[PDB]
């Protein structure tokens, strides 16, 4: 049976057992690529560290 | 014999059949590196893309 | 009153209260740039990956 599911994100990402869109994060203090299987979750966020664009950057990828 | 010919640069690029800094062009819409010697004329030029030099580019290769 | 304390540098660490040449090691997995100073112990290391150099490496540098 097709059910369009309405909601929040942070509610349709529980019940499609998916982080989708604008759900709530997991941030839990070490990296997520360091976790086995079955210890992620989907939600498992990381806020990297910022990286300047400039034109030199532009340069060396061309 | 030595004769100083004189006249328009397009003019002595086909007296000469040598190619003359201000005569006029061939363009011809694929690269003249791809064609083969008796397929070349002297005057099938090319204008290539631009590049923008930057700070960058002289940091590079100094 | 200078004193030579003798023993193992694992025993010296705790005496001088500074991690010296060969001592335990507390690796507790996050990052001690991440920790605070109140938070940072005479001991805390990090494992970091590994970089094979190579011959680019030594051109890129030079």
């Known amino acids: 049976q097709r059910?369009?599911?309405?909601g929040s994100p942070t509610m349709l990402?529980?019940?499609?057992?998916q982080?989708?869109?604008g759900?709530?994060?997991?941030?839990?203090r070490i990296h997520p690529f360091r976790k086995y299987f079955e210890?992620?979750?989907?939600?498992?966020?990381?806020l990297?560290?910022?990286?300047?664009?400039?034109?030199a950057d532009i340069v060396n990828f061309a």
Chains 1, 2, 3 share one sequence.
């Open 3 to 6: 059910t369009a599911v309405q």
């Open 13 to 17: 990402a529980a019940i499609s057992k």
């Open 19 to 21: 982080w989708v869109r």
């Open 23 to 28: 759900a709530k994060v997991e941030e839990d």
């Open 39 to 46: 210890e992620l979750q989907p939600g498992d966020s990381l």
């Open 48 to 55: 990297t560290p910022r990286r300047t664009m400039t034109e």
